[PDB]
Coordinates of C-alpha atoms and ligand atoms in Angstrom, one line a residue:
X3 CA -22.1 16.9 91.6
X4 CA -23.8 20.5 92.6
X5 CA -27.0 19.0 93.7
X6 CA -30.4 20.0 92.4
X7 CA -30.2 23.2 90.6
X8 CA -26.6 23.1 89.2
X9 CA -25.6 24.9 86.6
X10 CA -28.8 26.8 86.7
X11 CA -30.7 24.3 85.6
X12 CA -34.9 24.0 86.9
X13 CA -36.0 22.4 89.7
X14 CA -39.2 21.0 89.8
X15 CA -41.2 19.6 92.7
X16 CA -43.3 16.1 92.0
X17 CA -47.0 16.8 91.3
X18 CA -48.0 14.6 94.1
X19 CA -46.7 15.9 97.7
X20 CA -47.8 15.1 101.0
X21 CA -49.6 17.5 102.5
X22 CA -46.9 18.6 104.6
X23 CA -44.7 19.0 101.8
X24 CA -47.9 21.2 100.7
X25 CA -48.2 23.5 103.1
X26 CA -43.9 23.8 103.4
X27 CA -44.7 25.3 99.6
X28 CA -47.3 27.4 100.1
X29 CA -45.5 28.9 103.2
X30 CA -43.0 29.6 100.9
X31 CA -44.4 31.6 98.3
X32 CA -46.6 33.3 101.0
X33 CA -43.6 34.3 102.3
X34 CA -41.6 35.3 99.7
X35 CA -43.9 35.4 96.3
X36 CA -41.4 32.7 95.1
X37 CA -41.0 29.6 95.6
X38 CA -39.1 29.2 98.4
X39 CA -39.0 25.6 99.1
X40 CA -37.2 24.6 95.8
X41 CA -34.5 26.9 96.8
X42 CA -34.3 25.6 99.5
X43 CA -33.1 22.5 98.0
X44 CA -30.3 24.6 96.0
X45 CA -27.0 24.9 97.1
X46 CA -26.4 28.4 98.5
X47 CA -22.6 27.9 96.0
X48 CA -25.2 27.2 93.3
X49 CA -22.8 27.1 89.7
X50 CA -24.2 29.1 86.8
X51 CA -22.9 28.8 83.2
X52 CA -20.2 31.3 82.0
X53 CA -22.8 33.8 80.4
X54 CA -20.8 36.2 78.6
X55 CA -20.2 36.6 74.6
X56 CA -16.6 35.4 73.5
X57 CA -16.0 38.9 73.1
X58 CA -15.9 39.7 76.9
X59 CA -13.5 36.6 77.3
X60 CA -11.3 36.8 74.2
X61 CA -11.6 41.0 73.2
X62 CA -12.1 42.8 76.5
X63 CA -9.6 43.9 78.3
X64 CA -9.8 46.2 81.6
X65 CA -7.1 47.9 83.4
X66 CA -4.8 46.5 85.7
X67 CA -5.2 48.1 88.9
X68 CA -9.4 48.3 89.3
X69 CA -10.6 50.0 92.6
X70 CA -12.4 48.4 95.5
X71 CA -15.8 48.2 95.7
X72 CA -18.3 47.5 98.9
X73 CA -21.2 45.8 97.9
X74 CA -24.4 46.8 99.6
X75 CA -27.3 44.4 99.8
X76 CA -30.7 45.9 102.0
X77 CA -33.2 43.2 102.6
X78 CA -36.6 42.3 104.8
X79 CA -37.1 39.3 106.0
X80 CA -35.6 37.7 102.7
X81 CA -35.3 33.9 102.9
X82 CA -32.6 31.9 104.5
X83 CA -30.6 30.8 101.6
X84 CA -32.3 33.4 98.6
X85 CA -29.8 35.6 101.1
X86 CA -27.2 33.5 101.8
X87 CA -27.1 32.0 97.8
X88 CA -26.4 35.7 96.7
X89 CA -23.6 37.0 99.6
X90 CA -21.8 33.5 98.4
X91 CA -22.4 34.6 94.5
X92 CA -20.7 37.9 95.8
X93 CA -17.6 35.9 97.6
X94 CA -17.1 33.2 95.0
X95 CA -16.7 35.1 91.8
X96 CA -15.8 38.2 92.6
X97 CA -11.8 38.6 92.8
X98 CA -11.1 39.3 96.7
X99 CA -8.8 42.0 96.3
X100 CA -11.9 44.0 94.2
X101 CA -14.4 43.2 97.5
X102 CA -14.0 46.0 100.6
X103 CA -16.7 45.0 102.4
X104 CA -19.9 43.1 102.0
X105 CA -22.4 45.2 103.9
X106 CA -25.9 43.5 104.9
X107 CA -28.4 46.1 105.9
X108 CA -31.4 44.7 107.9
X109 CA -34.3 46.7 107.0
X110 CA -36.0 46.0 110.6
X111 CA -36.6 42.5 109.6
X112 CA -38.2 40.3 112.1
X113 CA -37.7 36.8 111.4
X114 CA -35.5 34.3 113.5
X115 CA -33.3 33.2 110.7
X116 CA -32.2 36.8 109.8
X117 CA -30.9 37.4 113.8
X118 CA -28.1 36.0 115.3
X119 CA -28.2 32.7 113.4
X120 CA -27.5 35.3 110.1
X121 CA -24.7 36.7 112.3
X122 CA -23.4 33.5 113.7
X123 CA -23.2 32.1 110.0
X124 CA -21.1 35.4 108.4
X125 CA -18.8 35.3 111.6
X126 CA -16.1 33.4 109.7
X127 CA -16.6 36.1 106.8
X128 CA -14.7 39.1 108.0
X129 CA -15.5 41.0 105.0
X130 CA -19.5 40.7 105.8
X131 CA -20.8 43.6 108.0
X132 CA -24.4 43.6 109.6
X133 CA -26.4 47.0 109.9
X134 CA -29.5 46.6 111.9
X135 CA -31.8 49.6 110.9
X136 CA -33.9 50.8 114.2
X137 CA -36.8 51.0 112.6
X138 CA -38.2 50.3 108.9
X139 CA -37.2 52.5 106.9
X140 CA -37.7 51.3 102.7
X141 CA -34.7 51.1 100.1
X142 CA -33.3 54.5 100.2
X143 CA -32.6 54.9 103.7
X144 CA -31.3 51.2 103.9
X145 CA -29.0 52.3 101.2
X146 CA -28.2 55.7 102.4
X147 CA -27.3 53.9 105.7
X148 CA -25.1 51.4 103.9
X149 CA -23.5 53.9 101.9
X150 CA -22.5 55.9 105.0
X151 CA -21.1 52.8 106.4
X152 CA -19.1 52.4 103.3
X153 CA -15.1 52.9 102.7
X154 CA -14.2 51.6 99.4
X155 CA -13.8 53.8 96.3
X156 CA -17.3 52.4 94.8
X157 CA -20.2 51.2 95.8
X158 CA -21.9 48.2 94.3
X159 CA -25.7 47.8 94.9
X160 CA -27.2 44.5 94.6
X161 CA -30.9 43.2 95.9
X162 CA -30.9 40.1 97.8
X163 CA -32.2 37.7 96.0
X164 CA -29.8 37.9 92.9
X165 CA -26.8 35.7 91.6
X166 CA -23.5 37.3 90.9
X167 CA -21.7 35.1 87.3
X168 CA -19.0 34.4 86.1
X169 CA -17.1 37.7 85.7
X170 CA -19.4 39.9 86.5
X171 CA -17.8 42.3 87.8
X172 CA -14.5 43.8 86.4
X173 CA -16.3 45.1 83.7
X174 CA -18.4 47.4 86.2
X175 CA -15.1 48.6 87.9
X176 CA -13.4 48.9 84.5
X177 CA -15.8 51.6 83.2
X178 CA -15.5 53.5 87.2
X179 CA -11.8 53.2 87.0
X180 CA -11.5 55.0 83.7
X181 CA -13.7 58.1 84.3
X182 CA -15.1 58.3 88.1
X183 CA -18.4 59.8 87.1
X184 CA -19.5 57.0 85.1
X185 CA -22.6 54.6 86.3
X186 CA -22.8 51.2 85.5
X187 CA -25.5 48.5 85.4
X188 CA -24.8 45.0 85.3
X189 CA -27.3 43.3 82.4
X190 CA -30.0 41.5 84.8
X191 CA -30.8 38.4 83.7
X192 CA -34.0 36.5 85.0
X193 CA -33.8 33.6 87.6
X194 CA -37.7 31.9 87.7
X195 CA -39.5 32.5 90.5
X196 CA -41.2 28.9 90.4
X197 CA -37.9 26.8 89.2
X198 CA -35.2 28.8 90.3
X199 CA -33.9 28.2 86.7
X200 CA -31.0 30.7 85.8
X201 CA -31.7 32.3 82.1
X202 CA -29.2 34.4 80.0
X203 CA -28.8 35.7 76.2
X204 CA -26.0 36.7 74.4
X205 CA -25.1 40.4 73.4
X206 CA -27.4 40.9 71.1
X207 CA -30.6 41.5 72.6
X208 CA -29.5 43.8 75.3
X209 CA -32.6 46.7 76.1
X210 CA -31.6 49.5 77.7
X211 CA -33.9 51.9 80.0
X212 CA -36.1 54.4 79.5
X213 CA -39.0 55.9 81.1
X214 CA -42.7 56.8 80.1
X215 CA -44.6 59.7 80.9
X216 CA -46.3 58.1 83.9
X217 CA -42.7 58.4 85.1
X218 CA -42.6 54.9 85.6
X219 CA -39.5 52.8 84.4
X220 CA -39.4 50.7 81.0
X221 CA -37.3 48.7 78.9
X222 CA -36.2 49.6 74.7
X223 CA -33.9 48.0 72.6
X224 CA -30.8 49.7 72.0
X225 CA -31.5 52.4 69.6
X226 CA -29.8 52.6 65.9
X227 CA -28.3 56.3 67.1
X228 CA -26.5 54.2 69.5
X229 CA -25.9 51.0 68.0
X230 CA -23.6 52.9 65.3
X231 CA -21.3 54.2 67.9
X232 CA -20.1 50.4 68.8
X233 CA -17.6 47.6 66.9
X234 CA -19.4 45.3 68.7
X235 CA -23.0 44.6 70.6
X236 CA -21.0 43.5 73.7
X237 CA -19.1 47.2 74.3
X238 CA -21.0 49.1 77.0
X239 CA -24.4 50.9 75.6
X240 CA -25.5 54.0 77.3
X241 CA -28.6 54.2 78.8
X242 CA -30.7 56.9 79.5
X243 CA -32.3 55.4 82.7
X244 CA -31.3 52.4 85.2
X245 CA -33.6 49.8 86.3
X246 CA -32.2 50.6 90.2
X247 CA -31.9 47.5 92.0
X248 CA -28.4 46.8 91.0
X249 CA -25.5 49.0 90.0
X250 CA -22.1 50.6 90.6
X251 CA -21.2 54.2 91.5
X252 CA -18.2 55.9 92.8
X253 CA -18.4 56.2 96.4
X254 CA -18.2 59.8 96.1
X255 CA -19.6 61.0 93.3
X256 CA -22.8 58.9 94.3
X257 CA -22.5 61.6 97.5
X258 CA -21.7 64.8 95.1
X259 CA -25.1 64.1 93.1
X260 CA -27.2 63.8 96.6
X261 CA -27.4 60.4 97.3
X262 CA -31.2 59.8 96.9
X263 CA -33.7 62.6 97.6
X264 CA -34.3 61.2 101.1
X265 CA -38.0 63.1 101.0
X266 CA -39.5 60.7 98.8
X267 CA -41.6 57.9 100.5
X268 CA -40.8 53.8 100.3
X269 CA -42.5 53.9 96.4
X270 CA -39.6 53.8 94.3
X271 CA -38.4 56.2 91.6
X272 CA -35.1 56.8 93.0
X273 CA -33.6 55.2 89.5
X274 CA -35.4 57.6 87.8
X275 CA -34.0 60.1 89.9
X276 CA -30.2 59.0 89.9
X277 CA -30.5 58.6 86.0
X278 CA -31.4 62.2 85.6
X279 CA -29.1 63.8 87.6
X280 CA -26.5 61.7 86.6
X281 CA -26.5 63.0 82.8
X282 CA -27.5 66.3 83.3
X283 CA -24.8 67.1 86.5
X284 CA -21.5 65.5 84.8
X285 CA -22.0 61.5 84.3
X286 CA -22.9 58.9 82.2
X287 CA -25.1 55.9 82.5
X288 CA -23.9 52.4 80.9
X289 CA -25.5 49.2 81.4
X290 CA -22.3 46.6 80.6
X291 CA -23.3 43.3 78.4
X292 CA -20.3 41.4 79.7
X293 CA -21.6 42.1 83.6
X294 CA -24.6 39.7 84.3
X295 CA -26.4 39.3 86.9
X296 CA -29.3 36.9 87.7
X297 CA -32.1 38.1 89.5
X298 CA -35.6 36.2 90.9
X299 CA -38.2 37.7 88.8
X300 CA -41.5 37.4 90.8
X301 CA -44.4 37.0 88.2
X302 CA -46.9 38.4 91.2
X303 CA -47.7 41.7 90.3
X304 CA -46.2 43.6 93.3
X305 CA -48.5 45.8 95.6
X306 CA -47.4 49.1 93.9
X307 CA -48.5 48.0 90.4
X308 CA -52.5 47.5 91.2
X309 CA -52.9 49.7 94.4
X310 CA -56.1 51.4 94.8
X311 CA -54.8 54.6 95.6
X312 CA -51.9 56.1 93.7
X313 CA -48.8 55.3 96.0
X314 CA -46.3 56.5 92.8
X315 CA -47.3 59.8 93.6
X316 CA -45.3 61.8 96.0
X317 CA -42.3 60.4 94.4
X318 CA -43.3 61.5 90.7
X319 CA -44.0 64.6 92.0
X320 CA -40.7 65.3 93.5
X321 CA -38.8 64.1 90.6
X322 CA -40.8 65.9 88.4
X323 CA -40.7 68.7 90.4
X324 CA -36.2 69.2 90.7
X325 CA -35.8 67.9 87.5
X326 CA -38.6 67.7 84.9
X327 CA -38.3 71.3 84.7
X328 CA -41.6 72.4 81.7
X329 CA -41.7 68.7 81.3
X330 CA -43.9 67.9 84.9
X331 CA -46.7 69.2 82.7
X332 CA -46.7 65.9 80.9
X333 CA -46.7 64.0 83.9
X334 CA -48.8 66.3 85.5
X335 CA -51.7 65.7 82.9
X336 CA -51.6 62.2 83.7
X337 CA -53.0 62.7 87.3
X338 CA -55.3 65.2 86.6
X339 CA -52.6 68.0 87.5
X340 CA -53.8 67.0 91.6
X341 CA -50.9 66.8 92.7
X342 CA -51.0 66.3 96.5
X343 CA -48.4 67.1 99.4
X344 CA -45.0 66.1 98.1
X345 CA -43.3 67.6 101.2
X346 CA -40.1 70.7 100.8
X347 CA -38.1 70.2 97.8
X348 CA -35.8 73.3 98.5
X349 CA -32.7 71.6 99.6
X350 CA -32.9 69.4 96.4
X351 CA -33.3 72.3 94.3
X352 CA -30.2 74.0 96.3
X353 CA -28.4 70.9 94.7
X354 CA -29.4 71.3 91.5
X355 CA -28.5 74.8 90.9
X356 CA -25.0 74.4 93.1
X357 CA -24.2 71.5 90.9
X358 CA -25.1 73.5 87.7
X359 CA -26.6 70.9 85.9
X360 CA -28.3 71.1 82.4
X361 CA -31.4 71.1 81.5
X362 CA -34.4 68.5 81.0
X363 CA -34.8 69.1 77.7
X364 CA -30.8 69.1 77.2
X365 CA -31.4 65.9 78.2
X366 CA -34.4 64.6 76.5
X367 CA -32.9 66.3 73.2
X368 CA -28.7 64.7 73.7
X369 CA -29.5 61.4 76.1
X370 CA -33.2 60.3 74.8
X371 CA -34.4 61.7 71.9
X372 CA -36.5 59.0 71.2
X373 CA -38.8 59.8 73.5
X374 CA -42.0 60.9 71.9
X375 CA -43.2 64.5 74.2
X376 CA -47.2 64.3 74.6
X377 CA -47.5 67.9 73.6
X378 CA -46.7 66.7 70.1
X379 CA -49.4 64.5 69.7
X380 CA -52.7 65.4 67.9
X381 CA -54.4 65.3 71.1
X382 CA -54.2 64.3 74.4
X383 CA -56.2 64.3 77.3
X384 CA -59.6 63.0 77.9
X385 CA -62.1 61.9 74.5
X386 CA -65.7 63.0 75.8
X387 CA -69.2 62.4 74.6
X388 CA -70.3 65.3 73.5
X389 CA -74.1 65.1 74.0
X390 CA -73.3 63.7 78.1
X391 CA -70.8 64.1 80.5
X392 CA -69.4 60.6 79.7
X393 CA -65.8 59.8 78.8
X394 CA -63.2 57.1 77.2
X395 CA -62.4 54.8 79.9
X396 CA -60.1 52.1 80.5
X397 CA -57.7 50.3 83.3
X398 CA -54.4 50.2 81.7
X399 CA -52.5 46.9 82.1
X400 CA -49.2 46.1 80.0
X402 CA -52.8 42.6 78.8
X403 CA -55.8 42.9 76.8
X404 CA -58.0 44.9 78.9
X405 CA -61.4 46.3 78.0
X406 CA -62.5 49.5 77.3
X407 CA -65.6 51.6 78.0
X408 CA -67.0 54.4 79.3
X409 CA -67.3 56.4 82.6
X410 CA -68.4 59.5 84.2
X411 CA -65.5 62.0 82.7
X412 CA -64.1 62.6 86.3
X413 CA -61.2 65.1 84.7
X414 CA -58.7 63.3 87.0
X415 CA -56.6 61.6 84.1
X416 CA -56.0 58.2 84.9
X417 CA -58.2 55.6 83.2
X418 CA -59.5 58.4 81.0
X419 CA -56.2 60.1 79.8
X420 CA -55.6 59.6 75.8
X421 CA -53.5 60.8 73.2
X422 CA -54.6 61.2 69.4
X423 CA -50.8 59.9 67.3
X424 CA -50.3 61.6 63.9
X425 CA -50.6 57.8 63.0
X426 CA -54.3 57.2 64.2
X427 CA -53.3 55.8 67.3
X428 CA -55.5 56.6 70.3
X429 CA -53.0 55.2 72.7
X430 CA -51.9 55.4 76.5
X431 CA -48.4 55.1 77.0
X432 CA -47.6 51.9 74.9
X433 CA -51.2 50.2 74.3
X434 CA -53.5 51.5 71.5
X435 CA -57.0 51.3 71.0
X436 CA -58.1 48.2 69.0
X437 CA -61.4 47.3 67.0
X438 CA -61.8 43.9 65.2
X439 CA -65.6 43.6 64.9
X440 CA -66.8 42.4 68.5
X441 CA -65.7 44.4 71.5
X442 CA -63.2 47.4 71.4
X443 CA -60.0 46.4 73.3
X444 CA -56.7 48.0 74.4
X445 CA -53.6 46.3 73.5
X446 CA -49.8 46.8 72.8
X447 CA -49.3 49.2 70.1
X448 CA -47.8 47.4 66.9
X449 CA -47.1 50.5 64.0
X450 CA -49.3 48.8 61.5
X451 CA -52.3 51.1 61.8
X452 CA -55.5 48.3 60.5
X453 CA -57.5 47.5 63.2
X454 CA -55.5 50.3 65.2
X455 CA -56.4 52.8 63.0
X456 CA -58.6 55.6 64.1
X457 CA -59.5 59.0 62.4
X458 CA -61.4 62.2 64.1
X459 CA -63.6 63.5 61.9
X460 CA -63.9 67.2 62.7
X461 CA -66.8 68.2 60.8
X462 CA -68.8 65.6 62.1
X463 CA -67.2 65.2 65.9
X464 CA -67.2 61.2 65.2
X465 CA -64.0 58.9 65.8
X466 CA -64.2 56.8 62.2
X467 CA -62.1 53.5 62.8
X468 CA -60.2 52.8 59.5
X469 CA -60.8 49.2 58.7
X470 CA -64.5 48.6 59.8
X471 CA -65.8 51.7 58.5
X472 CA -67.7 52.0 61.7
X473 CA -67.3 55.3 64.1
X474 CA -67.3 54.5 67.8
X475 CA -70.2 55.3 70.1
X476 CA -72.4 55.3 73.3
X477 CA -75.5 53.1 74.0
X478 CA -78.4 55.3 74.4
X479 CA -78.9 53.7 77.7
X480 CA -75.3 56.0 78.4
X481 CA -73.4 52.7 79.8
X482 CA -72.2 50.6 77.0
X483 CA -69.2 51.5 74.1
X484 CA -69.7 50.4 70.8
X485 CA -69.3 50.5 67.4
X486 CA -71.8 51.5 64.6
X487 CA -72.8 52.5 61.5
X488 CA -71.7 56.1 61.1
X489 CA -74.4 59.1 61.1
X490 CA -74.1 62.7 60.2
X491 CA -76.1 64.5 63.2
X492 CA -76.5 61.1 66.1
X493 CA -75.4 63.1 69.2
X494 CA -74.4 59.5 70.6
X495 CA -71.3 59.5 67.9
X496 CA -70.2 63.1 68.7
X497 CA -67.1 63.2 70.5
X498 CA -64.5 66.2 71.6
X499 CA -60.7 65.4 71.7
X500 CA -58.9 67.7 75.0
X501 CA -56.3 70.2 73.1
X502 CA -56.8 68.6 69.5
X503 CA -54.7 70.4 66.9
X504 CA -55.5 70.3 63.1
X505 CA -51.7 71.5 62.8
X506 CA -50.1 68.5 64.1
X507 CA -52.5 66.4 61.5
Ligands
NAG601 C1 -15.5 61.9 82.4 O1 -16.8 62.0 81.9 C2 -17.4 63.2 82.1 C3 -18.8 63.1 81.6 O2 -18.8 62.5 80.3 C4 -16.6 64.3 81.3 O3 -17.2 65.6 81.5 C5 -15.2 64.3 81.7 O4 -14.4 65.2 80.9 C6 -14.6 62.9 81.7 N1 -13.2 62.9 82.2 C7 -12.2 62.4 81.5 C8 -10.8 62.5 82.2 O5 -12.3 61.9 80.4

């Protein structure tokens, strides 16, 4: 009898609502960008299946004696009981005597709900603390601030709008207990934004996180080099970058490697920071297959991911800048090597050196060699019109997006490319595509055919393999296409930026 929602099951509103039910849901998404009114309806003690592979009930064993952990959770005017449903996840299956404190850090929110009826409601909780920032600050300083407020030998970071299972976390404390410097994600599993419907998957299709050279976070499998070093899919997998909305750290070490570099600005990159300098200054990185945690995946494309202006920047820079070391280049390429006002670095490069850390390419070569370096490539950079002054351009969505061709405005962005030793003229993971109507950009598949491409260097023309046509400009200098291939027609001439004969 849990009421709608139980065992993670989807709710789902009728398609006919009055039109105050209608506005109560659009409020809600407006709000929140999910659907707030369903949960709502959910009991803030939701249940959630048992998610974890027989192995982590029947195989797995952890030490006794598992320190303490605080468990920080920094939110903005998050909804009532998206808040409350994931302090109680917290509370109800973690064991108490692993739970210091559960420390809620108002990030300057300024709705009613979050004020004293949030402290009224936790005032039977002794283990929930309230930190009211003084002004809004973003997620690093709302974390830095929780951290400082934090006595327990590890800190757990969660987001607040997640859902803590069945055993999620002794597993997490287990790796911390047995060697202090290691990090540990939980695997996040996705709660729907529209239903609230919990999802999981067993052990065997745990990714693990990497990065691309936009220095923006992704998702791989696990790779083979790793797989082999495992019994069993559900043993911890190391991973050379974390997501960064939820994890464990010791309390200290988190402090020895700097915190977060508090100069960045409010647009994220701090995993990709704590992933490097974890490796490289004396850690490791494991996400855990028998720790899940559900987590509202918004389907809205947030702010960050389609501004006009580059907000990733300063950030990028900074990281790149400590601890990219030759590396930056790549990433520096990518934004037309402009690369702004990203403030003093000094005192993070003091840290560095004082913790003696290794080197980027120690490890890119040790933590993730399967990351392909640009410089390898056949060519990268921007794929010009010889005759003109215009240039390969596209907007890159991870989508089907369409290609053409602009004013080459040497910036890098929509008109950075790299030539693959496989034909590939690709951007990160999408490749240029031809099937006989318009030329396209899509995810790269490793079957060449359609996303096969040669340069022909005698000639300057891009030949595509299975048309037998060679890309081109309209006359009229606005329009890509694809024709009939001729020895001498300016309009199919086309210089690749640093392409090497060498490399294929
Ligand atoms: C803990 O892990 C670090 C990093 O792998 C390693 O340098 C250290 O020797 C380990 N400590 C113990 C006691 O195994």
């Amino acid at each position: 009898g849990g009421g709608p929602g139980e065992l993670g099951k989807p709710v789902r509103l009728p398609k006919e609502m009055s039109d105050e039910m209608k506005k109560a849901v659009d409020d809600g998404w407006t709000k929140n960008a999910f659907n707030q009114y369903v949960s709502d309806l959910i009991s803030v003690h939701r249940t959630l299946p048992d998610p974890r592979d027989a192995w982590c009930k029947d195989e797995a064993r952890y030490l006794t004696n598992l320190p303490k952990t605080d468990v920080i959770i920094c939110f903005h005017n998050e909804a009532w009981t998206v808040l409350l449903r994931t302090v109680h996840s917290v509370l109800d299956r973690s064991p108490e005597h692993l739970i210091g404190k559960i420390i809620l850090v108002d990030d300057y929110s300024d709705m009613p709900h979050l004020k004293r009826q949030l402290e009224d409601y936790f005032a039977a909780y002794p283990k929930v603390q309230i930190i009211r920032g003084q002004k809004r600050e973003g997620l690093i300083r709302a974390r830095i601030l929780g951290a400082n407020h934090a006595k327990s030998p590890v800190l757990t970071y969660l987001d607040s709008h997640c859902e803590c299972t069945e055993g999620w976390l002794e597993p997490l404390l287990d790796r911390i207990a047995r060697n202090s410097t290691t990090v540990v994600c939980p695997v996040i599993d996705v709660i729907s934004d529209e239903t609230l419907e919990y999802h999981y998957r067993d052990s065997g299709g745990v990714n693990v996180g990497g990065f691309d050279w936009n220095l923006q976070f992704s998702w791989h499998p696990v790779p083979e080099r790793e797989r082999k070093r495992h019994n069993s899919t559900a043993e911890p997998v190391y991973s050379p970058t974390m997501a960064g909305g939820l994890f464990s750290i010791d309390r200290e070490f988190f402090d020895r490697l700097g915190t977060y570099d508090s100069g960045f600005d409010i647009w994220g990159g701090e995993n990709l920071e704590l992933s490097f300098k974890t490796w490289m200054c004396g850690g490791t990185l494991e996400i855990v297959p028998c720790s899940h945690v559900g987590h509202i995946f918004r389907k809205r494309s947030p702010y960050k991911w389609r501004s006009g202006v580059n907000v990733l920047k300063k950030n990028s820079v900074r990281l790149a800048e400590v601890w990219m070391d030759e590396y930056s280049q790549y990433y520096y390429h990518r934004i037309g090597n402009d690369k702004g006002d990203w403030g003093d670095v000094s005192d993070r490069r003091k840290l560095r050196n004082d913790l003696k850390c290794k080197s980027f390419k120690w490890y890119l070569d040790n933590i993730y060699p399967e990351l392909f370096i640009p410089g390898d490539s056949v060519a990268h950079g921007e794929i010009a019109n010889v005759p003109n002054g215009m240039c390969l351009d596209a907007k890159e969505k991870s989508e089907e997006t369409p290609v053409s061709i602009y004013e080459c405005h040497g910036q890098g962005g929509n008109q950075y490319w790299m030539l693959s030793k496989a034909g590939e003229i690709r951007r990160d993971d999408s490749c240029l595509d031809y099937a006989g109507k318009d030329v396209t950009l899509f995810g790269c598949h490793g079957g060449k055919g359609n996303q096969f491409w040669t340069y022909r260097e005698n000639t300057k023309q891009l030949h595509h393999g299975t048309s037998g046509k060679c890309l081109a400009i309209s006359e009229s200098k606005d329009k890509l296409l694809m024709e009939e291939c001729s020895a001498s027609l300016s309009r199919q001439q086309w210089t690749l930026e640093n392409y090497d004969s060498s490399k294929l």
